[PDB]
Amino acid sequence: KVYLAIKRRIQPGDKMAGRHGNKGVVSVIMPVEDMPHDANGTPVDIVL
Amino acid sequence: STEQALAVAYWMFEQQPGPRSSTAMVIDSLRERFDRRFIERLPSGLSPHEWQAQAVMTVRFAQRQLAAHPLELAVVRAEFARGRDFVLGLAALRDWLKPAAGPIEQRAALALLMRMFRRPPSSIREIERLSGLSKSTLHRWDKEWRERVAALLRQALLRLEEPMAQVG
Amino acid sequence: LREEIPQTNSETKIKKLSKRLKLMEAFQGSGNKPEWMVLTVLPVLPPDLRPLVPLDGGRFATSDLNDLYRRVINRNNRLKRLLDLAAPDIIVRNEKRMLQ
Amino acid sequence: STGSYSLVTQQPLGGKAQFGGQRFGEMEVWALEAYGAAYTLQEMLTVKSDDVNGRTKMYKNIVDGDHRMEAGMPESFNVLIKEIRSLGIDIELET
Amino acid sequence: VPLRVKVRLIIFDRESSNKAIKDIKEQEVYMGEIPLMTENGTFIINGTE
Amino acid sequence: EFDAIRIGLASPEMIRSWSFGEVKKPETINYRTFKPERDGLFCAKIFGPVKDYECLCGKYKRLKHRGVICEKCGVEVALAKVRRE
Amino acid sequence: MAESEGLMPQDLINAKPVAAAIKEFFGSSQLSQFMDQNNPLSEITHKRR
Amino acid sequence: GRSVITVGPTLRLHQCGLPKKMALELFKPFIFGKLEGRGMATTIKAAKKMVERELPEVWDVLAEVIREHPVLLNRAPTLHRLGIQAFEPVLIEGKAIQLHPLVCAAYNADFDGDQMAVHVPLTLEAQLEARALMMSTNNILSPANGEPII
Amino acid sequence: ERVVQEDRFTTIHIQELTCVARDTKLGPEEITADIPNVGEAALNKLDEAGIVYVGAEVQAGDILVGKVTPVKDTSLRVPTGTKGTVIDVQVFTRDGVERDSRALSIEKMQLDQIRKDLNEEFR
DNA sequence: TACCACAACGAGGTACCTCTCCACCAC
DNA sequence: GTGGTGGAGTACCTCGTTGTGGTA
RNA sequence: GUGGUGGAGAGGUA
Ligand SMILES: [Mg+2]
């Protein structure tokens, strides 16, 4: 018997869910610029 | 093999059914895995639908390659392919070998070509009975047609041998 | 049944007689013979539709229909071979019952 | 696209593991007949599944670029016919 | 984990008392094997937890 | 084509008309000998060929006669799918 | 029917049924099932179920 | 085939997204036919060779056959004919099925992990039935009541 | 794109594939590297014992185990859609059957590890 | 004799995914 | 391996018909 | 001129 290792990168379609029963399927992965950014320049990662 | 490939393509076009997947015959072949001199080890070729599609691709490629010689393509269709393809090949062979043959003569020529193509009637006597022509004339026409068809088919096969190997 | 149906005006009996007439009329018009109801012979399913499949390691998996067929054939062979020697009547009727 | 089928009924197996095809459940066929679309229903019922002599030939047609789809006769129904006949019930078609 | 028990075969002559005292005592055979649930609350069967 | 599917009772006469044999052996294919048994649940005398266009002893391996029944190989050589009908 | 001299306690008992029952219970019971391990909370709640 | 849904807001109503691999798997006989026709396929073994290696050539013919071929879509619980609808697929890079947000109400399909089953009609008859009768544009009002459902 | 760039949600997946040595009544099977009708590059991926070298990236369809039937090949290939890195191989042999060089080597480093651990504990 | 309690048959949602596990005996 | 095969452990829905032996 | 899946059990998704 043999074993294999797979690095599953998260991609659109994968189901993501928080802790309060808030499920979700990742729709797209848009680049960092398109994310809404704070006046300080800090962008968010997730747009619920 | 090019000749084997052509034969298989014609056979798959004719026996298009593809057959139902078999049954506890599989168990026998599985009890042949054990058994011993079964010597029936599945060669593991292409899939049934895959093989049928392969035959179709081969037929299309042959039609494309032999397009420049309509008579050669018709002769190949008459010799190998069946159904409407065989009908078209026989019609073209009749129009070529016996262009101005009368309707009775055209029917006799079609019957002789069918007899050459292992199709009914299978006897020269039956051909004369259904046509009314002398046995000598029928024999002479058949001898000439067989030689002409063999030569044309050899020409087409020679033309395709390099193309078939280029297709594998 | 047709003669008797109107003789009695009671509802239940006339209902039963109506059902009898319906069955008899269906049989007569259908050309069906009631004696065929109790079968003397029965058909067998074609093998492909009741296949047994073996698995890796010499395991075989057989359909239920195959087991049922084996059982009934076994019991029929039992009947014939005990019958030709005129088995005791209790034993023969018992075997008839298990075959049924 | 195509693959092995069950030996009893020549229908795709049902597992992603078995490279199977989804089952057009009885509700799906109801939804299809709610539309006037019947040619597609007959296609998916007969030639896309359960037609030994139809699948091969429509493969031929598709690779030839034709979409003609000779109808055929599902083997699952003939299986039902065979088992009903084995139930001692006479079954036949009036031709 | 294996398991064995101690048993005694006590025959009698059916004289309504201590008759034919033949007490054959010996440790029994390995009566199966208990799966010995793991320290983490589970146990393994054929390599499967 | 066809039409007007029918329902009827089985007449033992027309049952025998349907039947291609009278199975007498409850046992089926031999595991030890990879073959079905005469009068078994899968007997070729009754149901048809295991592999398409073959006879029991392989006397007629040829595909030319698709309907003949060989002498030693009594079960008629024919198409393999016939095991379903 | 076996005499006290005729037999020994170890040969008297066949332990196959006990081992067979233990095995089928531990490998086939509705309650016995592959412990999920996708997340350490999953094992804890599975054992606490 | 089937996969999970993903909202495509850049999708026109008549069109839907489609993963590349599902497209090439489903339309495989069409790819074979086109490849043999245009000439980069002479034997089918070579055609299988290119489709398995996915040369840039195969994407062109794949897009061509997809171009005007309607595709058939349905969710798991189909409670009315709007539960199964036809679309004109659009190739996308991914493994999820992009769906038009307006049509989710008809499918009653949220993007909380719903899987969406796909089918393709083969005959010209079936494709015309899809485009003229089952296209998402065709069915706007509910069959239960004239109220719009998109 | 940060999360995929930062791999905040990337995960590791381990699945196993197993092969056994059967004893066809036709003739018993063996685990050999000499396989017919195979491209040499696939053999180069494999070892002389018929097993993939540990730590080899494997695309889909690549042969993994060297198995021979009569004399066809029952060699194992990774299923399509599966592509990763082989991290471990295990081999087990029935009593009365020889231990392959792979198993010999494996037992070798295991014995070395045990010896070193106990020697350090003594130390 | 027409109600009537009582017993038996017969139905009870789609689709998909993952795992394990499969008749006994027995000269 | 190749013939050969019978019961102590189990009973824990919920209507809705449909047919039946009992009483007014 | 040839192409390879039953049933049970458990869990899960919508
Ligand atoms: Mg949802």
UniProtKB/Swiss-Prot annotation, chain G:
User: Where, by residue number, does the polypeptide cross the bilayer?
Assistant: none
Superkingdom of the source species: Bacteria
Query: Its quaternary structure?
Result: The RNAP catalytic core consists of 2 alpha, 1 beta, 1 beta' and 1 omega subunit. When a sigma factor is associated with the core the holoenzyme is formed, which can initiate transcription.
Function recorded in the entry? DNA-dependent RNA polymerase catalyzes the transcription of DNA into RNA using the four ribonucleoside triphosphates as substrates.
Belongs to which family?
Belongs to the RNA polymerase beta chain family.
What is the protein's given name?
A: DNA-directed RNA polymerase subunit beta
Supply the source organism for this entry.
Pseudomonas aeruginosa (strain ATCC 15692 / DSM 22644 / CIP 104116 / JCM 14847 / LMG 12228 / 1C / PRS 101 / PAO1)
Q: Which residues of the full protein are shown?
A: 486 to 534 of 1357
Swiss-Prot record, chain H:
Task: Give the record's family classification.
Answer: Belongs to the RNA polymerase beta' chain family.
Could you name the domain of life of the organism this protein comes from? Bacteria
SS bond list: none
Which positions does UniProt annotate for Mg(2+) binding? D110, D112, D114
Parent sequence residues shown? 351 to 500 of 1399
Subunit architecture: The RNAP catalytic core consists of 2 alpha, 1 beta, 1 beta' and 1 omega subunit. When a sigma factor is associated with the core the holoenzyme is formed, which can initiate transcription.
Role summary = DNA-dependent RNA polymerase catalyzes the transcription of DNA into RNA using the four ribonucleoside triphosphates as substrates.
Q: What is the protein name for this chain?
A: DNA-directed RNA polymerase subunit beta'
